[PDB]
């Protein structure tokens, strides 16, 4: 498997984000799962919210995994960000956040859902692989390098 | 919360043990939950394969999160080790392994489950911890900062 792949499409890998609030990428990452899903970005939003106030989703070293629950969603979904400049993001290690990658999960959990965060976790955490991620320019290349992480 | 408090408790942090195998370690954690709950140690260390078999559950670091699905389980079970000798793990980075906390779930999926690994992730993920956990001599401590880390 690649497993980030059949819920992270081409779409939802967003390059250099020109951004200033956590409030902001949020929205954003509200507008990019309303693309390709049914979804109010409002939702995603303050779902996120509803979780980043509960404590930093900030794995360290400019990387984040906001994620949450959402009330109709039938598959999990996915997406990933990167940021001009990096935000402050409360971050465990006081750094700010430019590289984030978003899951979203139905209110039905799975068995998988914890398998899901917890391979996303194992890439952005590895740091030979963040610098390839925070360096990338070429969109298919960050799309195939994201999806086929460990295959 | 402080999350990990309720399913770790004081006997399930085990300082330094000298051991070889991946197998090893996975068998003398298998004894660990065997101890605190009624659970067959063997059952234990087998699904932590059927798990890792699938793909290396090391963070990066000397860091790894062995889990696993357990068949009678009634509320989540986690673990800390540390080696004497870090062993070969076979983590993204290449690096041995020393720390590792080892999570059970029910195979009833629960929506905590994901957000439970979530901060461990995180928890081993920050380095400034990492050398903490590392380095602490005093289990009482190693207990209240495993269960204390964002309160």
């Known amino acids: 498997m690649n497993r980030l792949a059949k819920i992270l499409p081409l779409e939802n890998v967003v390059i250099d984000l020109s951004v200033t609030s956590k409030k902001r990428v949020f929205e954003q990452a509200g507008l990019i799962f309303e693309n390709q899903n049914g979804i109010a970005?409002?939702?995603?939003t303050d779902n996120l919210f509803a979780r980043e106030r509960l404590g930093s989703t900030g794995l360290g070293e400019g990387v984040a995994i906001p994620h949450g629950r959402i009330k109709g969603l039938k598959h999990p979904l996915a997406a990933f960000v990167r940021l001009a400049e990096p935000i402050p993001f409360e971050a465990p290690d006081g750094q700010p956040v430019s590289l984030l990658i978003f899951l979203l999960v139905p209110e039905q959990a799975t068995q998988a859902h914890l398998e899901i965060l917890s391979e996303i976790a194992?890439?952005?955490s590895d740091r030979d692989t963040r610098?390839?991620?925070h360096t990338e320019p070429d969109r298919?290349?960050?799309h195939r390098l994201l999806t086929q992480w460990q295959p």
């Not at 970005?41 to 995603?44: G, H, L, Q």
């Open 131 to 133: 610098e390839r991620l």
């Open 122 to 124: 194992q890439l952005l």
């Open 41 to 44: 970005r409002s939702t995603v």
């Open 140 to 142: 298919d290349e960050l």
